[PDB]
């Protein structure tokens, strides 16, 4: 039979993930169905949301050549059933403390720090520059962990450097910027445009550099729609304009610069939503979601 969830030791939540200790040498690495908007957790949550995005990660895993954490397959036995589709299997690593974030266009903190210094995490970009544009080569763009409510802190090379050694640096650099661009070309010819993307990498007991986390899911990064493409505007988010646009929508009754908790979700904004993240694992993956694994 498969274990109970219960019979594992939780150590980490984040908004939306849950990690959980397996033995010595694996975690159970759960995605929720909840969702984030304007830096809230909502009250509603998307339903079938941690498996799709579950479903997606695994999807861009294979399709990279790079060593990642998975060990096992998603229906390994050592999952439980509550979470069957939307937890994996993972070799524990000894993390390394950079949020490796690629940038293929100019956007949120990235275009803020340009807009402000006219420099990105040490970049220093053409000028006339702005929302949306086209970043080529894409930038390396790498950033700390700040305070339980605050957001990643953007930081330099040298910061990189500083955490993780010279050389370490170097191929954290690298492979981040080859990952991005790999995964950003193949969804372009699907017609959703990566924008960004943001990566957790540890290492193994070898010294070996392996990409951990989650990867190339809408909440790791911007989706855009390619078809409507527009630079000098902020882009559609693929999956959560739906949101956005009722919770500063007349309908819900909530001031976004009140900073109060926002309400609830109507059930048809949360359906729709589902529906776009079917939308973008189909496109990219080639794949229907009806085959993906569930309880
Ligand atoms: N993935 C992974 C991982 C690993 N393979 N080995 C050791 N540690 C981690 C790890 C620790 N924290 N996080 C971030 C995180 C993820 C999910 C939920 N909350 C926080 C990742």
Known sequence: M??????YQHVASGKVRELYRVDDEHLLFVATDRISAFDFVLDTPIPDKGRILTAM????????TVPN???????DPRIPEEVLGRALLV???DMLPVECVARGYLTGSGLLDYQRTGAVCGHVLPQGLGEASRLDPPLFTPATKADIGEHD????????????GAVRANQLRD????????????????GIILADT???????????????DEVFTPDSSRYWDAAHYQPGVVQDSFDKQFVRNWLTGPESG????????????????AVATRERYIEAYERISGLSFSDWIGP
């Open 69 to 75: 954490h998975l060990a096992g397959p998603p229906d």
């Open 198 to 212: 943001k990566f957790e990498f540890g290492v193994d007991i070898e010294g070996n550099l392996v990409l951990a």
């Open 153 to 164: 802190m953007n930081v330099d090379f040298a910061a990189v450097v500083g955490l993780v």
């Open 254 to 269: 909530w001031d976004r610069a009140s900073d109060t908790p926002p309400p609830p979700l109507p059930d048809e904004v």
């Open 2 to 7: 498969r274990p109970s969830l219960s019979d």
């Open 175 to 190: 492979e981040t910027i080859k990952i991005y661009t790999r995964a950003a070309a193949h969804a372009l010819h699907k």
């Open 57 to 64: 990660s695994v999807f861009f895993f294979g399709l990279l």
């Open 91 to 93: 070799r524990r690593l």
